Amino acid sequence: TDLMALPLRERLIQTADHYFRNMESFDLETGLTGRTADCILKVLPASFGMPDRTNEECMAAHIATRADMTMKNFKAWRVPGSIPIVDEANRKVVFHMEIYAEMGDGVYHNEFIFIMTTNDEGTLLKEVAEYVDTAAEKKFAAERMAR
Amino acid sequence: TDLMALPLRERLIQTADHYFRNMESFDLETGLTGRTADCILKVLPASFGMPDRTNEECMAAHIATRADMTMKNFKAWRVPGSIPIVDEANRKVVFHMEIYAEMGDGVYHNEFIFIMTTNDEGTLLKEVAEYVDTAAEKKFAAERMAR
Ligand SMILES: Cc1oc(=O)c2c(c1C)O[C@]1(C)[C@H](O)[C@@H]3O[C@](O)(CC[C@H](C)[C@H]1C2)C(C)(C)C3=O
Ligand SMILES: Cc1oc(=O)c2c(c1C)O[C@]1(C)[C@H](O)[C@@H]3O[C@](O)(CC[C@H](C)[C@H]1C2)C(C)(C)C3=O
Ligand SMILES: [Cl-]
Ligand SMILES: [Cl-]
Ligand SMILES: [Cl-]
Ligand SMILES: [Cl-]
Numbered sequence: 001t002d003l004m005a006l007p008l009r010e011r012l013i014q015t016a017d018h019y020f021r022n023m024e025s026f027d028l029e030t031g032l033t034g035r036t037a038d039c040i041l042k043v044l045p046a047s048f049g050m051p052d053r054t055n056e057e058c059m060a061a062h063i064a065t066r067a068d069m070t071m072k073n074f075k076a077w078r079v080p081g082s083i084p085i086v087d088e089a090n091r092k093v094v095f096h097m098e099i100y101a102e103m104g105d106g107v108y109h110n111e112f113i114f115i116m117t118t119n120d121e122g123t124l125l126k127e128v129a130e131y132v133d134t135a136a137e138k139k140f141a142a143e144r145m146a147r
Numbered sequence: 148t149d150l151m152a153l154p155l156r157e158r159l160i161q162t163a164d165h166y167f168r169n170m171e172s173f174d175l176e177t178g179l180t181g182r183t184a185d186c187i188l189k190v191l192p193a194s195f196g197m198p199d200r201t202n203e204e205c206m207a208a209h210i211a212t213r214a215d216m217t218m219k220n221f222k223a224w225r226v227p228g229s230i231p232i233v234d235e236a237n238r239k240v241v242f243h244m245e246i247y248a249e250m251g252d253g254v255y256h257n258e259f260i261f262i263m264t265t266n267d268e269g270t271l272l273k274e275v276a277e278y279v280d281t282a283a284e285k286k287f288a289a290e291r292m293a294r
Contacts, residue, residue, distance in 0.1 A: 009236075044243070045258035045280045085234045085241055085262070089156075092232045094241045094262070096191070096276075111192035113260045113278050115232065115241070129243075131260050133192045135281035 003123045008088050015123060016084070016093035016116035020076035023099070026066075032059055036119055036126045044113075044131035048138075069144055070104035079111065091118045105143060110136050150270045155235050162270055163231070163240035163263035167223035170246075173213075179206050182272045189276040195284065216291055217251040226258065238265040252290060257283050 003011055018034040026032075032055050041058050043050035053061065065071060076099050078084075085094035093116045101108045110133050117127040150158050165181040173179075179202055188205050190197035200208065212218065225231070229243035240263040248255045257280050264274040 044260070045283075047258065047280055047283060083237060085232065085237060085239050087232045087234055090230060090232060094232055094234075096262070111194065113191075113262075115243070115260075131278050133194055133281050134283070135285060136192075136194060138282060 001123065004121065008122055009086050011122040012086050012088065012091065012093050012118055013084050015118050015125060016095070016114075019114070019116060019125060019128060020097070023076060024074050026062065026074065028063065032062075034124055035128075036124045039124075039126050039128070042127065042129040044129055045134065048132060048134050065144070069108075071101045071108065072103075074099065074101045076100075091120065091122060092116065093118075105147070108140065110140075148270060151268065155269055156233050158269040159233055159235065159238060159240050159265055160231050162265050162272060163242065163261075166261070166263065166272060166275060167244070167246075170223060171221050173209065173221070175210070179209075183266055186271070186273050186275070189274065191276055191278040192281065195279060195281050212291070216255075218248045218255065220249040222247045238267065238269060239263065240265075252294070255287065257287075 003014065006014070015034060022033050035055050037055070039055055041053045043052075076097055079096045079098055082096035086092070087094075095114045095116070097112045097114055099108070099110055099112060112133070113131040115127075115129040115131075116125055117129075118124060119126050150161065153161070162181060169180050182202055184202070186202055188200045190199075223244055223246050226243045226245060232241040233239070240261075242259075242261045242263070244259045244261055246255070246257055246259065259280070260278040262274075262276040262278075263272055264276075265271060266273050
């Protein structure tokens, strides 16, 4: 494909970044793209108590969160100064990210580490691990419940 | 050096891992080793409100934290399953870590991401960035306040 004609470093970055572009242009029609069938989302740290999720579990969560909290105009950007960290050998890419969205209750805007793992070919995501701001996310969860 | 004869990947992992070995064997006479003079520790996420610190600032903080909470027997290990993520071109290593210590009040045991950046030679750390468990670390700070 056109992905395979790119150098591996570049391919890994494009594949990993796609996760964010997908979130920004998300619709029910197309859903979550550029993931392997068996891809797993892991939410770090363990203390946060979010189990690993399949693509289908992720899609269900995101539809509901967006409805419940009237969220839209998602935008993701790298923390100023940060860079993509790419381990070609291990098919991994590490980003230091901000995610922003408008919602009924104001704005969602949190900071994250994401660790993406691709398939051997560097063309799809097989794992995404995101380390979240536990204090911030526990507050969002409490705003969402009964709200 | 012996370090310079090692392939760069291995050099980077050794220089990044040294940070945790230094933490385990920490003492007043030897201090913090394996860092550039101008090395900075960054604590993420920004919401946690901890400023960047110099080697001197880190050393003083650790002395204090160990005294105040009577902490000892530190151990660091990679989260089971995780691996070191090495970006040779950018001189970076990413670890998914647990840190454990005995203290008066029981046990400190938290989960992190560390992003280590070396000098161009890969022999010294010039930046350490650690993404912490904000709920957990808030508690620990609250417990450290008069107790
Ligand atoms: C495709 C997509 O659509 C969405 O609508 C949202 C998505 C994604 C990836 O991710 C975030 C931004 C968030 O990164 C992720 O989800 C959370 O449940 C929090 C809810 C937020 C609002 C959620 C929204 C987690 C704490 C585990 C977390 O970090
Ligand atoms: C050499 C060394 O000696 C020490 O005594 C400790 C050290 C190190 C590296 O690191 C930790 C384990 C911790 O990773 C770090 O410092 C904290 O302020 C909390 C206190 C803990 C106990 C602290 C103790 C932070 C919230 C920013 C944090 O993550
Ligand atoms: Cl997802
Ligand atoms: Cl070092
Ligand atoms: Cl330190
Ligand atoms: Cl770093």
